[PDB]
Model the fold of this input.
Amino acid sequence: NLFQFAEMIVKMTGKNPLSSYSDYGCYCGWGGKGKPQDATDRCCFVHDCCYEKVKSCKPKLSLYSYSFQNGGIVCGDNHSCKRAVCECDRVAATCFRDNLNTYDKKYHNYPPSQCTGTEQC
Done:
């Protein structure tokens, strides 16, 4: 669920998800239109595509199983639907950590007029 996605974001980036990843670019949080502005925005986009591929597990409401191991996340489910939701969140959160060097506050509360075009999953 997103309480768990938020748990993974604070441990991997040191950032608060509401201040940093709820409105950034064209896809983090309130978006869903345009092209990924940078790498962080791309982590969000891949994460939205990942969720649509697992439409049937109720991604946001699904409580899954994981642990933090050695500066990383390990999804520990047997159950296919929950392991997949966990994996979407796992790679998006580590994707955010990988790209903290390019993280630019320019993209906070990004103007809607700037999200132009379509990007295909």
